[PDB]
Design a protein around this ligand. Structure first.
Ligand SMILES: COC(=O)c1cccc(NS(C)(=O)=O)c1
Length: 291
């Protein structure tokens, strides 16, 4: 799957909030463009002159993630974070010259991402009480991956000492996206576990943190909550469910060609970190059938 690469696969079935450190530093920001940031300003002015109702927004930028030696005690992951914006994103990752910027970045900084906004997305493998994952159908009238299948998530907005506040706002925000879009009560939701981080190669390699959340409602109750919002309560145009049994082989189904890249990352990481049993019990041929 060339539109998704894994940057991080978390250990021990996935990492709780309490085992993650963030470092938020201007050292982690995008580098100024070779000819200067005037190019970003130009693209932005042109866009507002077509769509004057648009507004800019801060985003978290992923610089890198470092995993501790496996089976160690103490914090298991360090996320190195800076700040970007919607505007810097439109002017870099979504620019026509994004492939050229990545190459100038290798030359100048030995980093394909150095000239890119790279805002950090979040997504969820969201399981029901009756062992299904939740999927959403994207509007055919939005710009990014129109009419494709997606999982709940978003692009959180800002505001280990501030670092802990940052990690808390990342975990908080995956639950908040589930409450806003799927219309579920917060109290039906487990604390998220981080499964890993995936990169979208169709969007110049911008990264999404992928989480696992369990809901106490059955699929039938989740559908009722979703639909009871009405067309204005969600940006998606439908909801649907696949048995966890059937997620194992989803990359061999015709559904795979319809999944947007960040949802592909969420399913691959769910399969590697939450699926894939290590024990004799869940390893046994009758519980884990071959091929
Ligand atoms: C490039 O953007 C930043 O680093 C940054 C820092 C601080 C605040 C914001 N907010 S906004 C609404 O201007 O996009 C962006």
């Amino acid at each position: 799957d060339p539109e998704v690469t894994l940057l991080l696969q978390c250990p021990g079935g996935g990492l709780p909030q309490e085992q993650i450190q963030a470092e938020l530093s201007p050292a982690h920001d995008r580098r100024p463009l070779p000819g200067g940031d005037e190019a970003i300003t130009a693209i932005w002015e042109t866009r507002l002159k077509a769509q004057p109702w648009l507004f800019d927004a801060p985003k978290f930028r992923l610089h890198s993630a470092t995993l501790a030696p496996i089976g160690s005690r103490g914090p298991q992951l360090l996320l190195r974070l800076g700040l970007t914006s919607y505007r810097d994103f439109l002017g870099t990752n979504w620019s026509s010259s994004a492939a050229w910027l990545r190459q100038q970045g290798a030359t100048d900084w030995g980093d394909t991402q150095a000239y890119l906004a790279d805002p950090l997305g979040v997504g969820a493998a969201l399981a029901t009480a009756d062992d299904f994952l939740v999927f959403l159908r994207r509007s055919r009238q939005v710009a990014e991956a129109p009419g494709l299948v997606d999982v709940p998530g978003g692009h959180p907005e800002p505001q280990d000492l501030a670092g802990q506040l940052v990690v808390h706002e990342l975990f908080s925000s995956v639950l908040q996206e589930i409450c806003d879009e799927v219309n579920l009560p917060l109290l039906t939701l487990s604390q998220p576990l981080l499964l890993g981080i995936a990169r979208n190669e169709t969007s110049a390699g911008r990264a999404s943190a992928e989480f696992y959340v369990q809901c106490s409602l059955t699929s039938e109750q989740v559908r009722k909550h979703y639909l009871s919002g009405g067309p204005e309560a969600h940006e998606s145009t439908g909801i649907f469910f696949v048995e966890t049994q059937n997620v194992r082989r989803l990359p061999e189904t015709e559904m795979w060609a319809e999944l947007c890249p960040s949802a592909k990352g969420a399913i691959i990481l769910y399969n590697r970190v939450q699926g894939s049993p290590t024990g004799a019990a869940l390893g046994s041929p009758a519980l884990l059938p071959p091929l």
